[PDB]
């Protein structure tokens, strides 16, 4: 599973939020975020 | 040929045992699992057709 979202605002509150947010997976009324199971975006950008 | 009446089936000097062969169609079991010992018989059943 890879990080996917439905709205740009929910991606904004994912990216704006702190480290470890991509492991979580929240859901709105009709919108949703699936989170990647390993923090590969986190690690691959953090070693840079 | 050399047949046996009673006893095991073995080569001379008892170097290795001899097996009994039977074709698949004559083979017949009536249980899903076997005991520690099982006898082998002969069945000639007559279809009176």
């Amino acid at each position: 599973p890879i990080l996917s979202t439905t709205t740009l605002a929910l991606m904004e509150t994912k990216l704006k939020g702190g480290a470890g947010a991509f492991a979580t997976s929240e859901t709105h009324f009709g919108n949703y975020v699936v989170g990647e199971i390993i923090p590969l975006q986190q690690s691959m950008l953090f070693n840079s | 040929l050399t047949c046996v009446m009673r006893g095991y089936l073995y080569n001379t000097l008892k170097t290795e045992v001899f097996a009994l062969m039977i074709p698949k169609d004559m083979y017949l079991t009536w249980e899903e699992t076997r005991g520690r010992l099982q006898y082998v018989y002969l069945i000639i059943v007559y279809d009176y057709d």
């Binding site: - | 006893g7 097996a19 009994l20 520690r36 018989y41 002969l42």
Partner: protein, 48 residues
């Protein structure tokens, strides 16, 4: 008379019973094989 007949041939080890094949003039004939087996003959009993 004697719709079926029955007699004792022997007794086996109940673990060496396995499928092998006989070959005579390159003709396969699949067999059930009983390795450690001792003959024990008996007369033709019958049943109707």
């Amino acid at each position: 008379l004697c719709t079926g007949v029955i007699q004792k041939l022997g007794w086996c080890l109940a673990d060496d019973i396995h499928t092998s094949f006989l070959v005579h003039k390159e003709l396969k004939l699949s067999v059930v094989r009983l390795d450690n087996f001792s003959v024990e003959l008996g007369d033709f009993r019958e049943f109707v």
